[PDB]
Every structure is written in structure tokens, then in C-alpha cells.
Design a protein around this ligand. Structure first.
Ligand SMILES: *[C@@H]1O[C@H](CO)[C@@H](O)[C@H](O)[C@H]1NC(C)=O
Lengths: 181, 191, 191, 181
């Protein structure tokens, strides 16, 4: 479908594994907000959108409908389970690399299905905890997902990094290396 | 006698997933608006409501019972038919005040990698035009540009590389045009 | 106050791959013809020649040496620019006598499964329109159609299913239109 | 790209595994012919196309260029190997099933990459040889491939079949079952 702008009001997701759910709104491929289903609060991704209110109860009520529909389809589809796809991982910096200037490493994990993944960062081969964040699962027209993880860093000659991706479509965790050069 | 083209020589846990997408498609503002709500089992869309057709339609046999029940309820149908205005066009008015107002000027940097990389980073919206110049002539044959890169934080970036052989007095210019710019940004590079 | 859409309740060897595709795109016969030759490493297109641009352009950094070397050979550029006529338009004349003449009438079959399946099989070309009727009113809400199915043997098929409850005196009709048909094909089914 | 008709004149394929190559021409997504690289002869898929001649030496010379170009890219890319994707398999009949009427079972294997696959047929647990044929690897716009295998059969109440697909993207061979119902 061709359009000047495309929006999802919203992306509703519920899956048996967990079980887990997700509610987001998207405009032109970017996440406008998500609803924290556990805490029942709307978390705006864009500061200018904070001037609006969105009742988080809508997401909870909608996801509950998805849960009912999922149980019906599991029986009717004769327990047809999801197929694990091979995700595609790309690592790149947000800004041009300048040694000593704070930057952000971006790990794009594409072709995610089912939407269950672990995205972690390594620095000089050891796990990193501070400075890591990620988007929600972002929708694709083929109904798979992609997800983006961020790692703040100070580019230097003595630190190299890896984005570590765990997914059932991968027999081994996938490591995508990145160096400041 | 078909004539062909030659190539030239080089120098596990089980998971059941359900999705519902309330999508809106906009062209020429709100003049052309199309609503498509999709119900998806795993990665198979089973039933959808397309405002262009005006009723629920099963995409696969799995969606047929849902399409029949929903189409049987004329109250549900009438509210779905109004959603293109109540949801899509209504929400577009909010986008006009926010997302469609967002203007983030790109940062333009040139750094060597005989290869010059013009990094155009942290801009929004997507519309961008980047060109390379050696003095007064545009460079295109020796230029390779990445696709538009979505950072996920409501900014984009694009990297435009130019292969070049510097001479004395040569000035290379990266020319960037963006809706946020009053005048195009030009950055020069000298050896 | 963004307004959202609600959902409704349900009732190992290592391999290195290279590809070269000499593609031709035709619109309105041969009036509008576009040639795109693509050089692909694994699944990444690295360099292409688009007749709309008229020169070799690297798609990724891997293709830049090839694009530059080929663009430096003006003899190759001349013959590449002529390929839209020498290859695409020339071969289209052959298609006009063969593939574009191919007309295979569809076979239309109705078989019960409370679900009626109208199978429209073994037709060419792709253009097809299938409709269901219960007595003389068109059925759409309880209809589910597969996508167009490519058999790979230069025929297509499509299955259009209708949910129904049989009763005496009811006549169900599957209506099929195809470019090979002078009149539409109609097949009736009675309980 | 939008067009009334799209053709590939032609699809050229060469891969290190084997090594093996393929040369075909496609029009509107169907295989017009392939060149048997071993036997050096053009094999037309469509009978009306047999009125034409195509020099099989063109395919051999072109594939040789692909082999030379591949070796350069293997080094320039630092031996970046192909990624194994998960193929999607669907089995269906060419015609509606009528017992005693000759039919053809069709096994569609989609999302093939790299283009190395084994498609075999099973009947009551035994491999079938007679009545089996397949297309070449057919191109896709995302540069993966699909391939179709055919099994002629006389549908009967006591005979069921399976299409067996082996691919590096699958840890176990995939079996898609078919019954006359
Ligand atoms: C994610 O990590 C948790 C804990 O480390 C683990 O139990 C789970 O299996 C992981 N998920 C995947 C998909 O690997």
C-alpha cells in the first residue's frame, strides 16, 4: 500500500510464551508511545506528544480481547505454532566517530519472529550493564518485527564492542562486532 | 532468438502469537484516507476491515467465523465504517500539530575513510537530498549512498561516500537540502 | 487525545553467492521500457545499471570499484545505453508472438467441503475475477479467496470459498471472468 | 518497481558450494528456459518457445564472468558468507481432487537462500522417483529464490504423500503432508 503517511493506532500484540503483551502507536515507522501493561501507564517516546493524554486502560482492555482471540485460534488452527525466523543484525553508530566524544551504538535486529529476543552488549568481550536501552517491538508489513537497542559509549582506541542477540531462530547467540577504527 | 544481457568482469519453546493493527493510510493530508484493521494469527492475516470495501473480509479460512459474526452485527459495522473519520482523520489533526511539525536540522560532517564520507545525521523528517561536488561539477558516478537509516529515536541519518583523487586547489563540497533548512547546508573539504 | 482502534472478540557448508539479473520492465507495450541490470553479492545488490539514470551506480561500497571501472569504459557505456532496444524491446517482439499470446481458459469446479469451494484452475494469464452467488444475490461477507497461486508450469489457480447452509431449491453460482473467455464462465451448485 | 510486465534476460547464478551455476530467462515470474551447463544445451520450459534458438555458450561464458567476479568479492568482503534462511513449504494439488482422475501434487519451497535445497517426495513412507519433476531456482526481488517440485499421482483413499525439504536453514528435514480427503 502506497501512502504519504502510514500510522498504526495501534499495534496490539499478545503471545502465549510468558505470556506477554505489547501495546504501541506508530507513525511513519517510529514508536509514538507504549503502554506499560504492568504499571498501567502511557510512556511517550516523543517529548512533544506528552501534551496529550492516552487512557492506558484501553490497552489493557484491548490486549485482554487479544488473549481471548488467541485461545480460540490456537484450538481452531489445530495448535499451529509460530515459525522461528532468522533475525538480521546490524550495528552502527548514531553519529560519526570522534575519539573522546560521547556517542551511541545502535543495534538493529530485523526480521524478528516470534517477538521474543534478548539483545545485550559486550565491551572488550564482557557484558555491559550501564547505558543500555531499547525500543519496543516495531511492526513490519510482513507481520514480523524489528527492535533497536542502544549503547552509550566513549569511542577510544582500546574499547571494541559486540551486539549479542539471542533468538530461537539462532542455534548460537549472534555477535555483531563494531570497532571505532 | 532472445538477446541476453552480459555481466561484466570486476576490476525451542512453543509460541502462539496474535496481532491486531489499527492502521491508517494518509495521502494528500486528509483528502485521501484509508483505514485497514488487521487481525493476524502468528504471521498470517486472517481477517481485515478495509474502509475501501466497507465490511469485514476473511483473508484466510481461519478468519471466516470472525468475519461472519462481526458482519452480522450492523451496529459493529456502522462504527467500523465511521472509524476512518473518528480515528484516522481525527488523529491526523494531532499529527499535524506534533509529528508533522517536527523539524530537526541535520548535522553534516565530512571525514576521510581516497574516499570521502559525508555524514548527514540526526535529522527529521525523512525527506533529504545530498549531493557531492568537486569544485563546480556534481559528482555522481563515483558516489555511493547508504539507504535512509532509521535510528529509532525519531531521527534519521544517511551516509554519502565519494571516491576522489585530490589535486592541489581542489575543493570538495557536500550539499544537503532538508525541509528544516532555510538554505541548504554546504560543508567543504580540503586536503 | 489520540483515538485508537479496538479489537473485537472472536466468536554446514560455507556458501558465497553471486547473482546477475538482466531485467526489463515494460509498460504500455514497448512505449515505456526500463532496463535494470543488477549485480548481487549474496543478497546485497552492490552495483546496477538503470537505463533511467544512464550510467553504472554502486548500490553499496562493495560495488564502487566495479561501478567506477565500468563507467570509465565509454564503449561499455554506449552499448549499455543501447540495451533497452537491443535486449528489452527486441525480446518483447518475441514475447508478443509467444508468451503474450498465451491464452489458457480456466477450469471451474465446485465441490462441498457447509463450505463451498470454487476452484478456478489452470489458467493464463494472471488476470481473473471470481464471484459467488446464493440464488441471484452476490455473497461477499462469507467469502474467503486465496491469493493468486502460481503453479510454476505457466498456469495459475485460485480458490474462492463460501460459507453456506444448504437448503432445497437454493442455487449457488460461481462466476469467473478471464481474458481468454468470450463470455464469463458460470457453474451452478444445488443441494 | 511497477510495470505491466517484468522479465529477466536472464537470471545468472553462481555459488562457491559445488561449485554450481544456473542460467535461466524469466517472463512475468515464470521460467522460459534454462541452459544445462553440463550438457551445453538450452531446455525450453514452454512448448511455444521451442521455435527459438538460444546459444548455450552465452550462459557458459556469462557464468565464467560470475565466477571471476565472485572470487574478487569473496576477498574484498573479507569472506562474508551467505546467511541460511528458513524456507517456507506449501503443498497443494494442481487440480481439485477427484478420485481416479490424474492429478499433480505441487510442493512450493519459498524463501530459499542460499539456493541449495533437496526436495523429495514420499508415498506411504517410501521415496517416489517416477512422475517427479521440478523447476529451476526462480528469482525473487529480495534476491532469495523459490523452487517448485511436482509429483504426478492418481488420487486414491489409501494413498497419502509428503514433500520432504532439506535445507541448511532447517535443523531437521521439513515434511509437509498431503491427503486426498
Ligand atoms: C533470554 O534470557 C533468559 C535469561 O538469561 C533466558 O532464560 C531466555 O531463554 C533467553 N531468551 C532467548 C530467546 O534466548
Amino acid at each position: 500500500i502506497v501512502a504519504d503517511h502510514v500510522a498504526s493506532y495501534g499495534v496490539n500484540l499478545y503471545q502465549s510464551y510468558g505470556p506477554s503483551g505489547q501495546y504501541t502507536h506508530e507513525f511513519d515507522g517510529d514508536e509514538q508511545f507504549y503502554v506499560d501493561l504492568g504499571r498501567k501507564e502511557t510512556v511517550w517516546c516523543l517529548p512533544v506528544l506528552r501534551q496529550f493524554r492516552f487512557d492506558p486502560q484501553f490497552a489493557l482492555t484491548n490486549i485482554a480481547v487479544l488473549k481471548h482471540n488467541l485461545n480460540s485460534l490456537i484450538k481452531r488452527s489445530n495448535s499451529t505454532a509460530a515459525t522461528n525466523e532468522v533475525p538480521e543484525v546490524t550495528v552502527f553508530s548514531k553519529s560519526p566517530v570522534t575519539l573522546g566524544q560521547p556517542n551511541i551504538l545502535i543495534c538493529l535486529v530485523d526480521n524478528i519472529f516470534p517477538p521474543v529476543v534478548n539483545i545485550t552488549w559486550l565491551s572488550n568481550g564482557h557484558s555491559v550493564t550501564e547505558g543500555v536501552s531499547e525500543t519496543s517491538f516495531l511492526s513490519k508489513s510482513d507481520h514480523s518485527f524489528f527492535k533497536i537497542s542502544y549503547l552509550t559509549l566513549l569511542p577510544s582506541a582500546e574499547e571494541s564492542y559486540d551486539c549479542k542477540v539471542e533468538h530461537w531462530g539462532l542455534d548460537k547467540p549472534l555477535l555483531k562486532h563494531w570497532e571505532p577504527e | 532468438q532472445p538477446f541476453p544481457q552480459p555481466e561484466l568482469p570486476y576490476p525451542s519453546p512453543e509460541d502462539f502469537v496474535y496481532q491486531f493493527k489499527g492502521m491508517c493510510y494518509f495521502t494528500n493530508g486528509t483528502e485521501r484516507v484509508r483505514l485497514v484493521s488487521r487481525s493476524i494469527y502468528n504471521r498470517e492475516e486472517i481477517v481485515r476491515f478495509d474502509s475501501d470495501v466497507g465490511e469485514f473480509r476473511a483473508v484466510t479460512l481461519l478468519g471466516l467465523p470472525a468475519a461472519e459474526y462481526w458482519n452480522s452485527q450492523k451496529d459493529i459495522l456502522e462504527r467500523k465504517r465511521a472509524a476512518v473519520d473518528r480515528v484516522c482523520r481525527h488523529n491526523y489533526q494531532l499529527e499535524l500539530r506534533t509529528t508533522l511539525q517536527r523539524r530537526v536540522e541535520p548535522t553534516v560532517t565530512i571525514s576521510p575513510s581516497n574516499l570521502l564520507v559525508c555524514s548527514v545525521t540526526d535529522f527529521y523528517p525523512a525527506q533529504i537530498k545530498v549531493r557531492w561536488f568537486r569544485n563546480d561539477q556534481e559528482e555522481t558516478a563515483g558516489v555511493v549512498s547508504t539507504p535512509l537509516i532509521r535510528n529509532g529515536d525519531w531521527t534519521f541519518q544517511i551516509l554519502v561516500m565519494l571516491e576522489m583523487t585530490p589535486q592541489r586547489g581542489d575543493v570538495y563540497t557536500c550539499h544537503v537540502e532538508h525541509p528544516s533548512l532555510q538554505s541548504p547546508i554546504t560543508v567543504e573539504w580540503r586536503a
